[PDB]
Amino acid sequence: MSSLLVKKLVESATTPMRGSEGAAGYDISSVEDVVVPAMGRIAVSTGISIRVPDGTYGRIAPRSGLAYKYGIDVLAGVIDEDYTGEVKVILYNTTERDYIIKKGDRIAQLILEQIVTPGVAVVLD
Amino acid sequence: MSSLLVKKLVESATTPMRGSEGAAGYDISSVEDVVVPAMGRIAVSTGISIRVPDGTYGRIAPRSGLAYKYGIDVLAGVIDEDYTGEVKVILYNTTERDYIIKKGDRIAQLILEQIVTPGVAVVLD
Amino acid sequence: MSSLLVKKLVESATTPMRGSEGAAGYDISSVEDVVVPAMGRIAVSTGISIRVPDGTYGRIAPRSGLAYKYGIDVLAGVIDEDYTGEVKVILYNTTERDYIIKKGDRIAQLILEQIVTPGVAVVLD
Ligand SMILES: O=c1ccn([C@H]2C[C@H](O)[C@@H](COP(=O)(O)OP(=O)(O)O)O2)c(=O)[nH]1
Ligand SMILES: O=c1ccn([C@H]2C[C@H](O)[C@@H](COP(=O)(O)OP(=O)(O)O)O2)c(=O)[nH]1
Ligand SMILES: O=c1ccn([C@H]2C[C@H](O)[C@@H](COP(=O)(O)OP(=O)(O)O)O2)c(=O)[nH]1
Ligand SMILES: [Mg+2]
């Protein structure tokens, strides 16, 4: 069906899941203990691969929590409906102090955003 | 109805409003005079609480103006349809020079983005 | 029709185009050789002007490539359906080392994201 098809590639991996009735995203957790460097970025591995529903891509959005408290932001984050590989979550540390991530930690959130994918019309001949 | 239900929690607060026919967002103003630190972040208070329409969350997006001119970016920014609290706008100063915000200043913009919230289908048994 | 109407304003300009069947965005290329400064931002010119389809705005999203490899992020990025001017792509260099951009380089990607633009309902009288 056209829901969020998820495929774990490591048992450690968690199934994305929304935290509330009105929640906009499905939590995305870390599958490795990593350190996102001060003023630096890192590529955390989710351990899963997903197929967003049709006519809608998946945007890795930042979590209110880590943003406010640790100045953690999310770089890139555009997952195409044709992406068969593993979801990588690229975080950027806005702080002068390192951030610690442990297997299991919800490090971001997926949001199936509806988009229109029409053809291009070039004007000016 | 399913429009943008807004609830001011301080008279100082401004009603979000789109700046043009084709505008994608409703302006979100500051309700306090604050300073967003160089290479730092701050949590500006909007003074309002909103309920995005159904099947669509609210994304606090950055303003072309402040982005270009002061290197002001917007962290976090995901407001769930079930959020009953006050909207906080988390800004991050990309500059080596402080930025000044005064009650009333449009500091960001809300965008009711349509999303699909289906269930999760786990493959691999 | 309601597709992506594109208008080149310099022959150098490239027509936005999706890189795959499931791709979520249309590549947006640079039309000038520019340098986005370490820990700095710049406004790259696309040389084109577009009209996103109706009931959907255009979001300049970052490319997985440049994000991971050079720590390149995209500031602002909200293009309203009523924008008649030229698309400017504002990039922010997260790195301590400069980044080089050359006419033609795909520097970002446009994503026609569906949004709802209803009226505002103010509660509390
Ligand atoms: O934060 C991100 C952003 C993207 N992707 C995946 C989803 C998408 O399907 C693929 C895109 O890589 P690319 O588009 O082929 O390279 P580029 O963006 O330079 O065109 O990378 C991630 O795993 N994490
Ligand atoms: O910039 C933001 C981002 C989110 N929120 C609100 C909207 C949402 O309903 C709530 C989410 O907090 P949380 O999701 O419960 O904490 P976490 O993101 O770590 O799960 O915070 C804001 O006010 N400002
Ligand atoms: O990265 C961006 C972001 C926006 N715009 C364009 C699209 C939009 O139509 C216009 C908006 O400028 P503005 O909204 O009138 O100034 P402000 O955001 O302070 O209201 O700028 C760009 O070209 N590049
Ligand atoms: Mg940033």
Author numbering:
A (entry chain A), B (entry chain A), C (entry chain A): 1 to 125
Show the paper's wording.
dUTPase (EC 3.6.1.23) is a ubiquitous enzyme that catalyzes the hydrolysis of dUTP to diphosphate and dUMP, the substrate for thymidylate synthetase in dTTP biosynthesis. The 141-amino-acid deoxyuridine triphosphatase (dUTPase) from the algal Chlorella virus IL-3A and its Glu81Ser/Thr84Arg-mutant derivative Mu-22 were crystallized using the hanging-drop vapor-diffusion method at 298 K with polyethylene glycol as the precipitant. We previously generated Mu-22 dUTPase by mutating two IL-3A residues to the corresponding residues from PBCV-1 dUTPase. The presence of these two mutations (Glu81Ser and Thr84Arg), creating the derivative Mu-22 dUTPase, led to an increase in the optimal temperature of the enzyme to 328 K. Here, we conduct structural studies of dUTPases from Chlorella viruses in order to elucidate the molecular mechanisms behind the differences in optimal temperature.
Glycyl-seryl-tagged dUTPases yielded cubic P213 IL-3A crystals with unit-cell parameter a = 105.68 Å and hexagonal P63 Mu-22 crystals with unit-cell parameters a = 132.07, c = 53.45 Å, γ = 120°.
